[PDB]
Design an enzyme around this catalytic site. Sequence first.
Site, PDB file in Angstrom:
ATOM      1  N   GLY A  24       0.835  -1.213   0.000  1.00  0.00           N
ATOM      2  CA  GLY A  24       0.000   0.000   0.000  1.00  0.00           C
ATOM      3  C   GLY A  24       0.856   1.243   0.000  1.00  0.00           C
ATOM      4  N   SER A  25       0.241   2.427  -0.011  1.00  0.00           N
ATOM      5  CA  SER A  25       0.964   3.702  -0.198  1.00  0.00           C
ATOM      6  C   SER A  25       2.053   3.833   0.865  1.00  0.00           C
ATOM      7  CB  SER A  25       0.008   4.860  -0.193  1.00  0.00           C
ATOM      8  OG  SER A  25      -0.776   4.890   0.985  1.00  0.00           O
ATOM      9  N   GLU A  27       3.845   1.823   2.445  1.00  0.00           N
ATOM     10  CA  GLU A  27       4.905   0.782   2.458  1.00  0.00           C
ATOM     11  C   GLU A  27       5.857   0.975   1.268  1.00  0.00           C
ATOM     12  OE1 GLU A  27       1.444  -0.076   2.746  1.00  0.00           O
ATOM     13  OE2 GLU A  27       1.857   0.220   4.830  1.00  0.00           O
ATOM     14  N   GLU A  46      -4.472  -9.945   3.863  1.00  0.00           N
ATOM     15  CA  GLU A  46      -3.432  -9.865   4.918  1.00  0.00           C
ATOM     16  C   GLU A  46      -3.570 -11.073   5.859  1.00  0.00           C
ATOM     17  OE1 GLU A  46      -5.437  -7.228   3.894  1.00  0.00           O
ATOM     18  OE2 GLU A  46      -4.073  -5.672   3.204  1.00  0.00           O
ATOM     19  N   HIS A  69      -0.309  -2.863   5.254  1.00  0.00           N
ATOM     20  CA  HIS A  69      -0.693  -1.437   5.036  1.00  0.00           C
ATOM     21  C   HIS A  69      -1.576  -0.904   6.167  1.00  0.00           C
ATOM     22  CE1 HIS A  69      -1.893   2.330   3.213  1.00  0.00           C
ATOM     23  NE2 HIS A  69      -3.164   1.991   3.393  1.00  0.00           N
ATOM     24  N   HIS A 280     -11.505 -27.811  25.613  1.00  0.00           N
ATOM     25  CA  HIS A 280     -12.593 -27.129  24.836  1.00  0.00           C
ATOM     26  C   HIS A 280     -13.974 -27.693  25.202  1.00  0.00           C
ATOM     27  CE1 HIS A 280     -10.144 -29.553  21.978  1.00  0.00           C
ATOM     28  NE2 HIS A 280     -11.233 -29.821  21.247  1.00  0.00           N
ATOM     29  N   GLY A 400      -7.595 -22.079  17.125  1.00  0.00           N
ATOM     30  CA  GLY A 400      -8.798 -22.563  16.413  1.00  0.00           C
ATOM     31  C   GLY A 400      -9.341 -21.619  15.332  1.00  0.00           C
TER      32      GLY A 400
END
Lengths: 525, 525, 525
Positions: A24-25, A27, A46, A69, A280, A400
């Site tokens: 992106g701009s 980076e 991402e 970004h 769990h 998970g």
Amino acid sequence: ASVHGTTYELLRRQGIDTVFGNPGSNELPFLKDFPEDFRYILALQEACVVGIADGYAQASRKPAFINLHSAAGTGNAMGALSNARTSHSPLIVTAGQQTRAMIGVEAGETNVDAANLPRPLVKWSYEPASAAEVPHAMSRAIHMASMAPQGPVYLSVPYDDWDKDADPQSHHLFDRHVSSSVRLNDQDLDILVKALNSASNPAIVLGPDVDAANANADCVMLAERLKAPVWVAPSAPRCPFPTRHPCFRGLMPAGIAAISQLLEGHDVVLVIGAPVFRYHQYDPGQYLKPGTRLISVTCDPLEAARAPMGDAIVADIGAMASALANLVEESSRQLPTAAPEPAKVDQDAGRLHPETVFDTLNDMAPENAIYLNESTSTTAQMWQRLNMRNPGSYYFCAAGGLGFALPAAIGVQLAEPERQVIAVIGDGSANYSISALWTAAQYNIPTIFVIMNNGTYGMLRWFAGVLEAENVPGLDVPGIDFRALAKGYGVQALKADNLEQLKGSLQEALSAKGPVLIEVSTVSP
Amino acid sequence: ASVHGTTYELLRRQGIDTVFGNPGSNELPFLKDFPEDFRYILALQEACVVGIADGYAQASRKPAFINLHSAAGTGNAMGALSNARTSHSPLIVTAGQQTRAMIGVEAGETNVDAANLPRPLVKWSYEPASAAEVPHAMSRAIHMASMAPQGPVYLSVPYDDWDKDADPQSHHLFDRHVSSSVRLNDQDLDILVKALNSASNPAIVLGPDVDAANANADCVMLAERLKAPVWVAPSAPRCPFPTRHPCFRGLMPAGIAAISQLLEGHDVVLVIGAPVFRYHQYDPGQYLKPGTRLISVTCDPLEAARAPMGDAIVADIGAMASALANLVEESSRQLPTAAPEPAKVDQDAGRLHPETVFDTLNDMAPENAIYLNESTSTTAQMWQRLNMRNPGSYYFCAAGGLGFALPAAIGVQLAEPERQVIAVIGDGSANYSISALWTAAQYNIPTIFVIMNNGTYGMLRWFAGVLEAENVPGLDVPGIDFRALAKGYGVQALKADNLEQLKGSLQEALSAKGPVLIEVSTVSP
Amino acid sequence: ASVHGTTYELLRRQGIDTVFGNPGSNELPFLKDFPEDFRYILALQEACVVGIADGYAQASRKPAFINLHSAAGTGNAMGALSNARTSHSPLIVTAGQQTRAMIGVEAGETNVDAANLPRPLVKWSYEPASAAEVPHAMSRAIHMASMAPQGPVYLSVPYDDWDKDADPQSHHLFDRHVSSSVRLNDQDLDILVKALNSASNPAIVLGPDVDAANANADCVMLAERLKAPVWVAPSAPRCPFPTRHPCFRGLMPAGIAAISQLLEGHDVVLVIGAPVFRYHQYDPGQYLKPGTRLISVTCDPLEAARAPMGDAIVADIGAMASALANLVEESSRQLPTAAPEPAKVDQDAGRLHPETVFDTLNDMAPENAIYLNESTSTTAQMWQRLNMRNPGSYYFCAAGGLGFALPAAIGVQLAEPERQVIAVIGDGSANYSISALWTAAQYNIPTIFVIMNNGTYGMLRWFAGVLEAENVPGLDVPGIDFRALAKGYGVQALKADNLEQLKGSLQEALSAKGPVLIEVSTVSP
Ligand SMILES: Cc1ncc(C[n+]2csc(CCOP(=O)(O)OP(=O)(O)O)c2C)c(N)n1
Ligand SMILES: Cc1ncc(C[n+]2csc(CCOP(=O)(O)OP(=O)(O)O)c2C)c(N)n1
Ligand SMILES: Cc1ncc(C[n+]2csc(CCOP(=O)(O)OP(=O)(O)O)c2C)c(N)n1
Ligand SMILES: [Mg+2]
Ligand SMILES: [Mg+2]
Ligand SMILES: [Mg+2]
């Protein structure tokens, strides 16, 4: 020397040659003038970026460098970061901030209150107060990710920093070596050794930090000398032990009473590199039955503190396991008996039982295959039916969070080019990070993706049963064509509607030079 | 068994017998039915409460348990907590929350977003989701404070929890032993030992975690064997070394260039239990001069990561120092020469020079005196003029937060009843936690408080000079009567306007059975 | 123009001429070259600093500017900030950060993760990314504190910023006017007016935001026109109504059932500028009884959201109250009857009943006296016995945090020099912010401090009774000499051990030109 030049010198001096990212701009000033000795792996979202880096980090046993970004990119990756936390994955997460002059008025692409965004998942999160600080911040980031307990870190950098003069004294950063390869002092280690030697019916439970340390062989040594059964801790993100070794008892039940009952009769239970414990199913009862004492070796103070029972030692798993296995006496007790062969399940020439898919993979797949699992209904059967002889042969979303195994599979395959990666992914899980497929194709990463299509979120239909929860919407995911999605991202599309089709499809994917997706018609329970 | 009963059983089983606190409505249900084997130390303000606990924790080398009231009480203690963070002080901070039913509508005394309040100073901050969780939360709190790196933790408890049934399985908490007594593995320790044996002109820098570990004697052993000079790291919160030992070089300059220049010629610089480094004067230059390699042993990943130079090892200081000192070879090099006697300064029969006050204390005070310092102008002279032979003989606000030494002095004295505590406190610093005096009087804690009255914030007048900052308001604090304040809280009030008056006042306070305050007229620079 | 010059131009252009603070190294570059048109009020501890600013802010109805030192100073003030939040006090809190170059290595006096520290108490917390941003950050701070709902804000500034060039475009900041003087649109206001006109037995409850707005006279107008009884909302931080007006019903019970029962028979209950509601006694039951509808006008979305019943309107209290009172019809209903005269209580010529102290103050003190209350046992009697005719005549710690009334009293007195401030403070509360006394003396601020000495935390002995909590330690605070403490800080020390001594002491303090403290022997229940 610019902040740019000094940062890339520190990365390479710290052993980093790869950048996982979505640009992106903010980076472009970091990503421009990309050094010849570095490589950029692009993912289209991402979640996919971080999942790839995660797999790569976990298989390599080294830091993986990410570049996203601003808020939107970081945000898109936050589910993936939730897995990296429990995984203890060394992920260096960087994100372009808007210029220092523009931050105040909150111009487009400004990451507001940047270091707070990825909390509470990261060990460390920071935005430097000056461009000359950036290299020093990166040094902390690299060391904060790599020190035990390993985990994700987050650095936000205004994009105008990159071009500014670096502090010359930043060169002291380049060759910094930080060690946490520590183990309990001799006096207390001897006491623990004496209690393991004098244990009558010792028991061992192993977790993901053993496979992370490559402490697998030392834990086999230990289990042989103690002549003790070995379980893997519940919600296992990795495999720390040969699954066909005489001592291996497989995956632990995720319930309190179930585990206590299991452990009853074992005078000393040694847990290594696992939380105590990742329950769990809420199946209440006693944590431990009388006569059972628990000792936990963990790399994570958090794990040591939260254990509802037992002693703990906070140390590096490799160092502890190595020391424990060499010091321990050879018991004259008999080695436990290997677990029986799994039952072959009833199979017609229609839709495939998962038990059949796993038996077929065990027979056909290489001995040094790496497996990934995001087929949430079938985890138990996969642990029983897959013979995993070597370290780094199993990955499963640690917290998970679905959308890990597909990108992670690509990252593992890139980290381990001589080992066939085979990702067994449910029809449901496949969608979370589906755009990751493109990366396998763009960089010719020969990951095999096995889609278990039962047209449903099977694990949730099961959970709703246990809960006796009726009239739950959104449990079914019909009308997905996975061969069309693979083609969509340039990945070869095979299918298996029966056993003969699965045998031939598998045989084909093994010898294929690029990524293959196999859509499997599986039985809907 | 109630949550109350189970919590007090866990505290006593974990070795806690003392509660430092200021009460309020939300704490009465925890504080009622106070066990006979516990004791409550009341302070009149929560800065004082925590400062007392801090001193007690630091001198005892054990967790100190605190109990404050909601947001307002926690908030009042936050400056004190800022010192505890840098100190690595094991402080268990609890605070009464309003009933679970009342939290929603934000009734009076509700701590809103409770766990966020004390961040970012604490290692761990939590409010349990149920009354049965409280004991388990306390267990985590106790272990999170005691594991390396030690530090403050924060637990918020709705007041209606205390009376509810405890989970019977909480009994597994009672006897949990968690160890971080870890040291570098043999292979890497041998390499470090080999580099210390082959060092030409080795140098040692020691920090507060050495005195915390009681690693002092092992560090003397090490310095003798290596025949190496020993400095204390800048902004020293404690004293890790006999200050009249031949190897002791005193306090380090707090500047970058100053320390590098100091270290020039030393091929290997071993730092133990200190950040690298707590600079305060910004005097820029090289971090290290060529030919100087730095190795840092620290208990704190944060310290390891942020060091702008050198190798680091994250481990327990006691274990590292013990191992290092026994493994290291006896150099045939000559022991460094003891530092010279300090110059006696010019003194008339009027206002006292701090140099004179320190010489007088060195001569008269017991050999096993414990000193505290909140006289910010005179720190350098006090390090030179006080012979501190034993461990736990010096405390100074670790993050520089004033309002520590007065309450802390009381806490140290309570922890060490056979050792005369003497707090040397500036006229300015005395006011921050002045109400702490009452506690010394109420519990007959024979702390001596020496007030250095120059009628000003001397350190700030000096700093304004260095900065060439003119026309700064609020640097002067005239019109304070410290004998009136001592009387205000029932503490005996002596004065010293000259040397003979200081000799006699000191002699009196030493043999006094209760707390004494001595107001000293000192020279205003 | 420097950041320094531009910042002081913005402050004065925004109407700020006063700085409340305790200095330190990181504040000297802001505090140097102190403009002639500004004044600095020094307090000896940061609780005292903020408490003074708070009182000044609340009495002035304007932002108060604070300057503290790093983490330790901010931290010391956090209890005081917990009161400012509930108070909706416009407090601009600034704190010196270490130089941008030094922040990275965490040099002494570095505020780590600065903006997180004062959360969650502040509306806004920030550290600028560049020195040129500082003025813009200050502008946001000033406007974030002054917009409804008003509250504390926090700005952290690296000390090297002050000397750097300001952005010339910062001049656009200087004259920015931001308004929240808003009220419900005509259509919905008419509907609400129509429902107030057609109410049979209307009721009014008023909170601190009415006194903040100086909406008192408009609320009297409203109560007359509606011929409706007027209560003050529980845990009242201020007084919004003449307490001897025929409609005034006094302080509300702090219980759920109590308030519902109280409100039963009232068809429409209009709450203005109060949370719904600040309960503290947990006395459960119905929130409202059938036939009672509640409408709440509040300046705070938080208050509107958390109300367990009724309609709400989020708007400026001055604008709403002004509009409501001018639009509402004159009821032909009879004005409610004035509350009776309080009972004179039994009094001998020994220790004073609080009821007697309050009767004496009502008789002797000026008609435009300002009262402050930190005598937690006696709040109910003080509301009944003090005739408060005018706005800004009552302040009480808004979040119940002790250590407010003593410093706040000084701040109110400085803001209102023509009005005699009389702080009635319990023996217990006096200690929290005792060092605030010095400021009254140093700047000759003629605040009268009335210490109610019952030798105990009376409110807590009462609470322990209600709870039937026995064997609570630390409820008693014997052995405090308040005349010695006043002398300690240069404040004139009177006493009253009987009625005649209280009459004469009061008479003396009224005509005294400086601060007076009166230690009152009161009856211990
Ligand atoms: C990001 C995320 N969303 C939702 C879930 C909840 N979840 C757990 S298993 C599951 C079903 C996955 O279905 P599939 O991949 O088809 O596997 P099956 O259960 O059918 O084997 C879901 C949605 C989760 N863990 N993570
Ligand atoms: C809570 C807090 N507020 C302010 C400071 C800044 N500060 C550092 S030294 C100092 C002066 C202390 O004066 P005093 O105790 O008289 O000692 P002197 O410098 O005169 O020796 C101050 C205010 C601080 N460190 N902590
Ligand atoms: C900072 C803080 N600590 C503790 C409390 C709890 N508390 C509420 S009232 C009270 C007693 C105050 O006693 P005193 O000033 O003597 O007044 P009395 O109750 O005797 O009238 C205390 C400690 C609080 N509200 N704030
Ligand atoms: Mg499925
Ligand atoms: Mg001084
Ligand atoms: Mg009292």
